């Protein structure tokens, strides 16, 4: 199931739209670019919702790129191990700070070969996240989505979750 | 906020303020591509195409410009506390006559925080460029461009050096 949380309240603008309130949970039926087909878990009603009005509610543990109990050195150890290449990344709990997370990704370099950059995922008041103040995110899911299709700020794109 | 008209401009749209090349104008409102301005010559007010003018303001006040600043002091003054990746400044070229040089602090893997230098060549009609790719009517326009995009430089000009 594709669960999402309403970040804001939405009043139906166009016919076929599904209205909802901030905090409300919904399930995603269809992904159509900016508009998504959703079903309210409250009333079972369906309709289209503006994709940027919600955030993935699914737990992070099941994510292919999340590794809760992983140390900074371990990340380097696995990221640099064979079976991975430039672009490989993972998200782990921050070591230097609690309640936070760190982004680890393998990159190349003309000087030294494959390397491992670590980016601190800073927390936000409303609970949000961000690596660079240029772009903020409601959740780690969204953050990963963004940098998997664009690297604005990073040496490389989050090409693929670390492999064992 | 004074500008100089790079070209003459006849009013095309209602509300437009027409002007001749060389005229100075005061920018009132910067509405994206059409700015609101007042002729310093006639006192008339209107909208003008932003790309037809250039900043006429002085270089002294500018936070990023330093008249008589050696190249060694730029590197020292730059790697000093209060500045980081993206810090920059412009000074007169100590190696070339009548020119300017761009100094910005970057970062290298095996070198750490370094200080790169780019020379600003002068264009025939008085413009400027770091890269023949893009040219500018003035230094203000040049700084503006690069602080809003690493269009060639290793980094966008983030913050003007701090004393």
């Amino acid at each position: 199931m594709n669960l999402v949380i309403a970040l804001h309240s939405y009043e139906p603008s166009h016919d076929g739209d599904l209205g909802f309130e901030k905090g409300e949970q919904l399930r995603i039926l269809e992904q159509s670019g900016e508009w998504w087909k959703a079903q309210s878990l409250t009333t079972g009603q369906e309709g289209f919702i503006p994709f940027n009005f919600v955030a993935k509610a699914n737990s992070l543990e099941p994510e292919p790129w999340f590794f809760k109990n992983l140390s900074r050195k371990d990340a380097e150890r696995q990221l640099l191990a064979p079976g991975n290449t430039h672009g490989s990344f993972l998200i782990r709990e921050s070591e230097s700070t609690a309640g936070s997370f760190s982004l680890s990704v393998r990159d190349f370099d003309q000087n030294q070969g494959e390397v491992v950059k670590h980016y601190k995922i800073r927390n936000l008041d409303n609970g949000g996240f961000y690596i660079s103040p240029r772009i903020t995110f409601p959740g780690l899911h969204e953050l990963v989505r963004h940098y998997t299709n664009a690297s604005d700020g990073l040496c490389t794109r989050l090409s693929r979750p670390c492999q064992t | 906020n004074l500008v100089i008209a790079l070209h003459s401009y006849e009013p095309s749209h209602d509300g437009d303020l027409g002007f001749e090349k060389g005229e100075q104008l005061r920018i009132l409102e910067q509405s994206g591509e059409w700015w609101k301005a007042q002729s310093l010559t006639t006192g008339q007010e209107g909208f003008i195409p932003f790309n037809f003018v250039a900043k006429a303001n002085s270089l002294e006040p500018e936070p990023w410009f330093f008249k008589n600043l050696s190249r060694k002091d730029a590197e020292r003054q730059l790697l000093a506390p209060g500045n980081t990746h993206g810090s920059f400044l412009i000074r007169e070229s100590e190696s070339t006559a009548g020119s300017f040089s761009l100094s910005v602090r970057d970062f290298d893997q095996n070198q750490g925080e370094v200080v790169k230098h780019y020379k600003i060549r002068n264009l025939d009609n008085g413009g400027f460029y770091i890269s023949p790719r893009i040219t500018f009517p003035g230094l203000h326009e040049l700084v503006r461009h690069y602080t809003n995009a690493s269009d060639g430089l290793c980094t966008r000009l983030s913050r003007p050096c701090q004393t």
Binding site: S102, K117, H118, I131, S132, L154, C155 | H85
Partner: peptide, 6 residues
């Protein structure tokens, strides 16, 4: 220490 928006 960490890296950043290079």
């Amino acid at each position: 220490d960490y890296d950043y928006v290079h």
